[PDB]
From a paper:
The molecular target of diamide insecticides is the ryanodine receptor (RyR), a large ion channel expressed in the membranes of the sarcoplasmic and endoplasmic reticulum (SR and ER). RyRs govern the release of Ca2+ into the cytosol, driving multiple events, including muscle contraction. Diamide insecticides directly engage and activate insect RyRs, causing uncontrolled Ca2+ release, leading to tonic muscle contraction, paralysis, feeding cessation, and eventually, death of the insect. Therefore, we designed a series of insect-like chimeric RyRs that contain the diamide-binding pocket from Sf RyR and the remaining parts from rabbit RyR1 (rRyR1).
To gain insights into the binding of both classes of diamide insecticides, we solved a cryo-EM structure of chiRyR in complex with TET in the presence of the same modulators (Ca2+/Caf/ATP/CaM1234). After masking the transmembrane region, an unambiguous density of TET was visible, which also bound to the pVSD, with a local resolution of ~3.2 Å at the binding site. This confirms that both classes of diamides generally occupy the same binding site, in contrast with previous reports suggesting that they bind to different regions. However, there are distinct differences in how these two diamides engage the RyR. First, Lys4563 and Asp4815 adopt conformations similar to those observed in the chiRyR-FLU complex but form different interactions with TET. Asp4815 forms two H-bonds with the nitrogen atom located in the amide that connects the anthraniloyl and pyrazole moieties of TET, in contrast to FLU, where the amides on both sides of the benzene ring participate in the hydrogen bonding. Second, the benzene ring of TET inserts deeper into the groove between the S2 and S3 helices, facilitating the formation of a cation‒π interaction with Lys4563. Third, the pyridine ring of TET, which represents a major difference between the two families of diamide insecticides, forms several interactions that are absent in FLU, including a cation‒π interaction with Lys4563 and π‒π stacking with Tyr4564. Finally, the H-bond between Arg4824 from the S4-S5 linker and the sulfide amine group of FLU is absent in TET because of the substitution by a smaller amide group. Ser4792 forms direct contact with the cyano group of TET, which might contribute to species selectivity.
Numbering used by the authors:
A (entry chain B): 244 to 292, 299 to 323, 333 to 360, 372 to 427, 434 to 630
B (entry chain F): 1 to 107
C (entry chain B): 1648 to 1751, 1758 to 1788, 1793 to 1873, 1923 to 2014, 2020 to 2047, 2091 to 2216, 2222 to 2262, 2267 to 2369, ...
D (entry chain J): 1 to 56, 61 to 129, 135 to 148
E (entry chain B): 3634 to 3684, 3693 to 3737, 3750 to 3972
């Protein structure tokens, strides 16, 4: 269903629309009045028909729209359509039905129309629109990868899932989200940060966090790296060790720095700590826990004694790792405010054995 | 469970009586041997009054069982000190303690 | 293994370095029960041994120094640094002999001499581990360490380092010149702020900085220093300029008690000469406007006018100007490098010419130091509001107050748990019976005590976690607001925040806001309009929903709020009625806004009969099944709510003298209130008889009270009026002669609930109509 | 406003209150409130005792005690202030202040009253007495 | 109660010392003047000479620029920056029947001190923090505009050329919106708090040895006056030399995504001023004489009106 919204979903990934006229060649000519075109949603990849619909069932008879100013009974292009000034509506070219409302003012093609279909357009931004289409390119691969895994999720083996397609697709995303260097100039470092703060908020809002959380929890159940990967066979079994480690690097690259996405783990905190001794990518999950426990202080005081007793049990089974002492050093204070409930759970557990 | 094994004998006749202070230059360990405490490192002769239960029960019961200037090794059982919970942060639960004391002066 | 082997091990150096971060983070922010627990694991001698073993590696030296202050010299550090910004001087004769310049125009040494400003002692406790466990414990002090031994060791390690640094050795202590000084300055800086150094010790420290200036080797400032070591130099030098300023204030406090003792005998001799002067009468009162006609605040303002009509002689008016020239020359104004401000202004600027400094912390600590010297006058000025002067007989209770103040500021920085709540209540309960909190309300305001108790109410409200705390805090502010009027003026300023958390038994944050505006025309006239519309929007909710706690208690359901909505009208009846009089500008805007949401009125009149609404209340109050079934009866709160909606509008009725004038706006309102309510509804309410106690006592909080009648009589006597003799005698026999002889019968509990009702509500109204 | 009492009374009050303080808490019984005022020479009967506690459980706390101490000494000084206020007008001190000696003592006091209001003070009131003057000032 | 005032010698001496400090600071220390504001800025400028590195002053305004660019929602009130905002502002106010030559040296010495700041990058520091305000009309944007005037006082030219390029390479929408935000939060003449002040003015001295601090209440009506005058005085000085590009910039930020057209926004404050002064006439149209406080209000509103008509005409003094 089509809707309307305020300003919050105005900036985000959903409210991005691209225009597709019927003629193939010179499609990036100037659009003029009375011109037929299609409407594409960028993230879903669906075609607007007053519902949105798939491209395979998008027909020129079913969905073909146009820009008119007002309904009088009627190479490149000349510069017809200004920005912010045209204030023009849409209607079907076969039906003439004006899309209008009824906070979610449901948009409907209505033959009465209104006095409020005079709507002004705004062009998007280049870095944002590039970030848009790759969501569709990834989620189309990922949900294909999930249900490809779900096929033999119960049936042992006595289509082929996209192994090589997903390995390269994560690695471009890590370098997409890579934090800028400290040796950079200060005025430019700060400028590149606020770009990064958008385009991780622009992912975790429009899905893409729990969707990453899913493909972990379909994969983590196979703790034997080969024997429980033999439900697929020997082909995907050799790459099972890689695909977990790259996955936790993505998630750790998402919630680095950002406070707003760090609160998204306040519900499934116990989902994280339960996988610390998983013996594969043990540094990986421990990396994710460290970046979440320094940005949003509300995740400190929701931690009970059952969690801390696992972390000391992690240190006792993974050597004298100096990263484990970091996360315990973040567990004492937050924003210059200490937690007296946590400052004794460490002490009467860690110290008194002296071992 | 107060076992006193002597290390060096003192006067043999002077004993602490009640309502009185002592000065002990003690040190302690655990049964593993890890030295959780001393007094000479703080360079202070530790003092206390007997009877008023300032120290744990295994300490003052060992204290009047010594002579002046004697050096004794004590062994306080779990039930006589820090029994169930133990000290927070220092002494683990159900820990048997091992001491090395010395009555400096004043009975 | 030997610990010096970590210098090449390079892996267990790191893991034993990060363990020292866990040790400093566990005993962080005054956690002193655990601070004894670390004193077992790292002993006292081996910490003092590690301060000078030069062959220790780099990051392990800065650990064992910073571990030391975080278990011994931090809990005392924050509490004294807090009391540095305020200056509380007593009148001992040791105070009385304090000058700006030392006697001998040669500028004295900074930090050297005698100061008299009050500071609490530190209260260390020695560690032990054989003491028996009790049990809630009161508190644990910071574990102790012998300080007089420590200052000789710390001075020595600094004293070699400024000397060994001149040798330009290729192998510095700890692997750099950075680690040679940063863990020895930030210990010396935090032993200098705790004041435990002797003056002859800081005489040596002044030599070790730049001996060419501070004399009564090469100086430390001339030495080439890396950037972080300059930072601790600023934190060392910032202590010294404050000791110039605190000495300057303590000089000026010494000047005044010498001055006003000289000034009182001058006035009382001049007044006695005025008392015997009969040579004038019209000019005598111009000399008598100052003596007993002006307030004593206006006397000193008038007395001190002789710069460029003063009753003071030329002898004691010149020495003030002689003193005033002694102070500007003491400051940086020449008032036509052998000076400290001459030294700093040279040194800080030259540091900018050395290199382009990148660390933003140092560039802030530089320029804040530099501006402090040039506007040395304004540096004296901004501290002076925190200057207060007490009696020497009050010091024995004042320092007992300040220690009970410090526990609160220590609880500012720790997230509140169920133990320190009992520390806060026992603290606050020990403040409000300490007798000096009352007799100097300027000083309690000067210490920011009224600010401090607000933020601990901020952090708890953010469901209520700790309700027993939040009552005793807002109880303290309500008892604070009536100590002086200007304290109520200060508490008034946080109104919109206090208003945002109006959302139970006991007291409340809203009764703080009520006691911030009571009994004062200044605040009530200055009360905002946007601060008013928030009050009615919370009144906009209560008429539509119930109390969820009451239906959780198993009470009958009532769609509006007879208990919650009455917690706003008792506020607003202090918002328009003051000193037994109504305001105009608030009354003309509360009722214009109260009629934009007519749901805010009680829905029986939004409608059933008003006497019938109370008649609907008597059945549901007398019948226990329709009553709330324990402290809350629904029938007692509905009559109490309508007792609040009535007497509010009675106290917004425009006054009679404005009705004698033809103020059309003022009579427009008097139309509206008379238009809303029928008069004869009141008459059945004013005449309904009550369950008088005799031989048995009825229940006050489930039945009719005389305070229900007391609201109604104020409404008719202020907006409707008693005109003619018949309507006077109409309600006269029906209402009150039933109650009067019911009151004359018992000549007892509700007898005293009705004795004061008659003597405050109706017997005035009879005497309004006695002719 | 609790400032209308001077310091030494609160010093005397706290000395009296701590003397009969129950456990050092600052709580006292309802009976001890009567005894401590009679320890301060004040002798009010149970009528003046009864209305004061219900104005504010049997537990009297020191601020709750002190706010009652303000009101008991606010009303007494509010009436004895105005006869001694008239004392400075008349040269004798009885009440016989001549009206000629008023229009310079009233424009010279510090409420910044001009000649029009001190006129307006007078023609809406020979020498006038004191009791008409405490009537014409309180109004 | 004015008659029962106790004398000073009856008071305890510690309270007598307390009111003295509140008096002695008020009549002597506050009244004292000194000129340290110029003998600081010279040595922060001259010390770059020694035996491409920045100056001591040039380091400072770089640091204040860096704290204005970090992403924060609000602009935290630093007392230190306000302590340096006025000191650099007073470096030009010493120069801010005469001969012809002697006023030119009084003019050109002001262009010397204006050069002593804005070649060290003082022009873009004062342009960044207005974008870092985002409309919060606090105490800092008071103290940042007095520096913005003392650089552009007298109609300097190249500081405008140092300002147009900064708003054209950055495309910084957020400046002009914060400009538009401060414009609407400009108080005008009311007819409600005016009599609130007047009813407050009926009290001259408060009971129990207290004084009604008339500066504490102050002017509840139009206390926004000197600030909102100062913004238009800043706004007048952006097109003083008839710099025609700002005449086409202040109505259209054509490089930017979103125009604001402050010229139209200057009109809309004037209309809100226009009814606000006209209804002040209708209150007094029945009265005969005008008292003292009635004129002080009306002196205020026209003094800001002369500022805004002058700031209007510099948008159109050029043809």
């Amino acid at each position: 269903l089509v809707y309307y919204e305020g300003g919050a979903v105005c900036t985000h990934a959903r409210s991005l629309w691209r225009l597709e006229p019927l003629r193939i060649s010179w499609s990036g000519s100037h659009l003029r009045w009375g011109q037929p075109l299609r409407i594409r949603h960028v993230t879903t990849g669906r075609y607007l028909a007053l519902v949105v619909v798939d491209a395979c069932k998008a027909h020129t008879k079913a969905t073909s729209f146009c820009f008119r100013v007002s309904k009088e009974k009627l190479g490149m292009g000349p510069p017809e359509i200004k920005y912010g000034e045209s204030l023009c509506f849409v209607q079907h070219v076969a039906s003439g039905l004006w899309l209008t409302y009824a906070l979610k003012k449901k948009a409907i093609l209505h033959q009465e129309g209104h006095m409020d279909d005079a709507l002004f357009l705004t062009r998007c931004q280049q870095e944002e629109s590039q970030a848009a289409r790759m969501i569709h390119s990834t989620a189309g691969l990922y949900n294909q990868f999930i249900k490809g895994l779900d096929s033999f999720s119960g049936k042992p083996r006595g289509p082929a899932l996209p192994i090589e397609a997903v390995i390269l697709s994560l690695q471009d995303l890590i370098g997409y989200f890579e934090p800028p260097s400290e040796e950079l100039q200060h005025e430019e470092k700060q400028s590149k940060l606020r770009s990064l703060r958008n385009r991780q908020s622009l992912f975790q809002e429009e899905g893409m966090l729990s969707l990453v959380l899913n493909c972990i929890d379909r994969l983590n159940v196979y703790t034997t790296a080969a024997h429980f990967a033999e439900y697929a066979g020997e082909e995907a079994a050799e790459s099972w060790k890689e695909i977990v480690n790259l996955l936790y690097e993505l998630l750790a690259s998402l919630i680095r720095g950002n406070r707003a996405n760090c609160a998204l783990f306040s519900t499934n905190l116990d989902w994280v700590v339960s996988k610390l001794d998983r013996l594969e990518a043990s540094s990986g999950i421990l990396e994710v826990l460290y970046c979440v426990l320094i940005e949003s202080p509300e995740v400190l005081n929701i931690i009970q004694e059952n969690h801390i007793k696992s972390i000391i049990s992690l240190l006792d089974k993974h050597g004298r790792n100096h990263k484990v002492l970091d996360v315990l050093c973040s567990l004492c204070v937050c924003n210059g405010v200490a937690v007296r409930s946590n400052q004794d759970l460490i002490t009467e557990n860690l110290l008194p054995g002296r071992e | 469970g107060v076992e006193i094994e002597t290390i060096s004998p003192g006067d043999g006749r002077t004993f602490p009586k009640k309502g009185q202070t002592c000065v002990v230059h003690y040190t302690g360990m655990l049964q593993n041997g890890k030295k959780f405490d001393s007094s000479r490192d703080r360079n202070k002769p530790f003092k206390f009054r007997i009877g008023k239960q300032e120290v744990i029960k295994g300490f003052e019961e060992g204290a009047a069982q010594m002579s002046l200037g004697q050096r004794a090794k004590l062994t306080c059982t779990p039930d006589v000190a820090y029994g169930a919970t133990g000290h927070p942060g220092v002494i683990p639960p159900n820990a048997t303690l091992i001491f090395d004391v010395e009555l400096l002066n004043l009975e | 293994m030997d610990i010096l082997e970590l210098s090449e091990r390079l892996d267990l150096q790191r893991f034993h370095s990060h363990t020292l971060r866990l040790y400093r983070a566990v005993c962080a922010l005054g956690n002193n029960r655990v601070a004894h627990a670390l004193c077992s694991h790292v002993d006292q001698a081996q910490l003092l041994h590690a301060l000078e073993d030069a062959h220790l590696p780099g990051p392990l030296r800065a650990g064992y120094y910073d571990l030391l202050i975080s278990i011994h010299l931090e809990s005392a550090c924050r509490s004294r640094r807090s009391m540095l910004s305020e200056y509380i001087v007593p009148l001992t004769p040791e105070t009385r002999a304090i000058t700006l310049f030392p006697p001998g125009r040669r500028h004295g040494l900074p930090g050297v001499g005698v100061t008299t400003s009050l500071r609490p002692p530190h209260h260390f406790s020695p560690p032990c581990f054989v003491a028996a466990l009790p049990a809630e414990a009161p508190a644990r002090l910071s574990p102790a360490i012998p300080l007089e031994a420590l200052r000789d060791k710390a001075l020595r390690m600094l004293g070699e380092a400024v000397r060994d640094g001149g040798q330009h050795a290729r192998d510095p202590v700890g692997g750099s010149v950075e680690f040679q000084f940063v863990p020895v300055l930030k210990l010396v800086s935090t032993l200098l702020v705790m004041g435990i150094f002797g003056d002859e010790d800081v005489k040596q420290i002044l030599k070790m900085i730049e001996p060419e200036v501070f004399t009564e080797e090469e100086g430390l400032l001339q030495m080439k220093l890396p950037e972080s070591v300059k930072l601790q130099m600023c934190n060392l030098l910032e202590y010294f300029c404050d000791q110039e300023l605190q000495h300057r204030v303590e000089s000026l406090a010494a000047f005044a008690e010498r001055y006003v003792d000289k000034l009182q005998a001058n006035q009382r001799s001049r007044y006695a000469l005025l008392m015997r002067a009969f040579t004038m009468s019209a000019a005598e009162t111009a000399r008598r406007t100052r003596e007993f006609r002006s307030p004593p605040q206006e006397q000193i303002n008038m007395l001190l006018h002789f710069k460029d009509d003063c009753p003071l002689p030329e002898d004691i008016r010149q020495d003030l100007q002689d003193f005033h020239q002694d102070l500007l020359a003491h400051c940086g104004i020449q008032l036509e490098p052998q000076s400290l401000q001459e030294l700093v202004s040279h040194m800080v600027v030259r540091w900018a010419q050395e290199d382009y400094v990148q660390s933003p912390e140092l560039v802030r600590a530089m320029f804040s130091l530099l501006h402090r010297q040039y506007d040395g006058l304004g540096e004296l000025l901004r501290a002076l509001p925190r200057a207060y002067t007490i009696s020497p007989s009050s010091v024995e209770d004042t320092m007992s107050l300040l220690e009970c103040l410090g526990q609160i500021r220590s609880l500012l920085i720790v997230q509140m748990g169920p133990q320190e709540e009992n520390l806060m209540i026992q603290s606050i309960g020990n403040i409000m019976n300490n007798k000096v909190f009352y007799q100097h309300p300027n000083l309690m305001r000067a210490l920011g005590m009224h600010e401090t108790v607000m933020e601990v109410m901020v952090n708890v409200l953010g469901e209520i976690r700790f309700p027993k705390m939040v009552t005793s805090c807002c109880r303290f502010l309500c008892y604070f607001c009536r100590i002086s009027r200007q304290n109520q003026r200060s508490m008034f300023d946080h109104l919109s925040y206090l208003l945002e958390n109006s959302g139970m038994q006991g007291s409340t944050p809203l009764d703080v806001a009520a006691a911030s505006v009571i009994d004062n025309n200044e605040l009530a006239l200055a009360l905002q309009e946007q601060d008013l519309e928030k009050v009615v929007s919370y009144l906009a909710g209560c008429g539509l929903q119930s109390c969820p706690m009451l239906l959780a208690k198993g009470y009958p359901d009532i769609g509006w709020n007879p208990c919650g909505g009455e917690r706003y009208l008792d506020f607003l009846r202090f918002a328009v009625f003051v000193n037994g009089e109504s305001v105009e500008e608030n009354a003309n805007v509360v009722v214009r806004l109260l009629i934009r949401k007519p749901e805010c009125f009680g829905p029986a009149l939004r409608g059933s009969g008003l006497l019938a609404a109370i008649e609907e209340a008597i059945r549901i109050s007398e019948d226990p099944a329709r009553d709330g079934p324990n402290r809350v009866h629904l029938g007692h709160a509905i009559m109490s709510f309508y007792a609040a909606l009535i007497d509010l509008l009675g106290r917004c009725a425009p006054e009679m003298h404005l009705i004698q004038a033809g103020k059309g706006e003022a009579l427009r309102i008097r139309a509206i209130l008379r238009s809303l309510v029928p008069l004869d509804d009141l008459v059945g309410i004013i005449s309904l008889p009550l369950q008088i106690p005799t031989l048995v006592q009825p229940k006050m909080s489930a039945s009719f009270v005389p305070d229900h009648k007391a609201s109604m009589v104020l409404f008719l006597d202020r907006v409707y009026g008693i005109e003619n003799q018949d309507f006077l005698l109409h309600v006269l026999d029906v209402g009150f002669l039933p109650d009067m002889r019911a009151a004359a019968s018992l000549d007892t509990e509700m007898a005293l609930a009705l004795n004061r009702y008659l003597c405050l509500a109706v017997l005035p109204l009879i005497t309004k109509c006695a002719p | 406003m609790a400032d209308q009492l001077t310091e030494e009374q609160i010093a005397e009050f706290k000395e009296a209150f701590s003397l009969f303080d129950k456990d050092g808490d600052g709580t006292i019984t309802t009976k001890a409130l009567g005894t401590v005022m009679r320890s301060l020479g004040q002798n009010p009967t149970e009528a003046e005792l009864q209305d004061m506690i219900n104005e504010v459980n049997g537990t009297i706390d020191f601020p709750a005690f002190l706010t009652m101490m303000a009101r008991k000494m606010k009303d007494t000084d509010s009436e004895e202030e105005i006869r001694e206020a008239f004392r400075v007008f008349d040269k004798d001190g009885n009440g016989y202040i001549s009206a000629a000696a008023l229009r310079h003592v009233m424009t010279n006091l510090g409420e910044k009253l001009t000649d029009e209001e001190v006129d307006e003070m007078i023609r809406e009131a020979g020498q006038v007495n004191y009791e008409a003057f405490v009537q014409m000032m309180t109004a | 109660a004015c008659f029962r005032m106790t004398p000073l010698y009856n008071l305890p001496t510690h309270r007598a010392c307390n009111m003295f400090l509140e008096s002695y600071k008020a009549a002597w220390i506050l009244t004292e003047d000194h000129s340290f504001e110029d003998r600081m800025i010279d040595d922060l400028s001259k010390a770059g000479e020694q035996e491409k590195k920045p100056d001591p002053l040039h380091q400072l305004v770089l640091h204040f620029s860096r704290t204005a660019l970090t992403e924060k929602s609000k602009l935290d009130e630093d007392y230190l920056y306000m302590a340096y905002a006025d000191i650099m502002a007073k470096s030009c106010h010493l120069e801010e029947e005469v001969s012809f030559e002697e006023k030119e040296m009084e003019k050109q010495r002001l262009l010397y001190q204006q050069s002593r700041l804005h070649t060290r990058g003082a022009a873009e520091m004062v342009l960044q923090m207005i974008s870092a305000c985002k409309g919060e009309t606090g105490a800092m944007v008071s103290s940042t505009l007095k520096l913005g005037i003392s650089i552009l006082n007298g109609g300097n030219a190249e500081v405008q050329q140092k300002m147009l390029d900064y708003l054209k390479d950055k495309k910084e929408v957020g400046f002009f919106q914060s400009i538009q935000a401060l414009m609407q939060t400009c108080s005008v003449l009311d007819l409600n708090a005016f009599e609130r002040q007047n009813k407050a003015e009926g009290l001259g001295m408060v009971n129990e040895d207290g004084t009604v601090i008339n500066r504490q209440n102050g002017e509840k009506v139009m206390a926004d006056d000197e600030f909102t005058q100062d913004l238009f005085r800043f706004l007048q000085l952006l097109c003083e030399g008839h710099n025609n590009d700002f005449q086409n910039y202040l109505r259209t930020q054509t490089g930017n995504t979103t125009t604001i057209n402050i010229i139209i926004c200057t009109v809309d404050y004037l209309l809100r001023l226009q009814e606000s002064i006209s209804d002040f006439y209708w209150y007094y149209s029945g009265k005969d004489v005008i008292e003292e406080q009635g004129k002080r209000n009306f002196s205020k509103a026209m003094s800001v009106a002369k500022q805004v008509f002058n700031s209007l005409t510099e948008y159109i003094q050029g043809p």
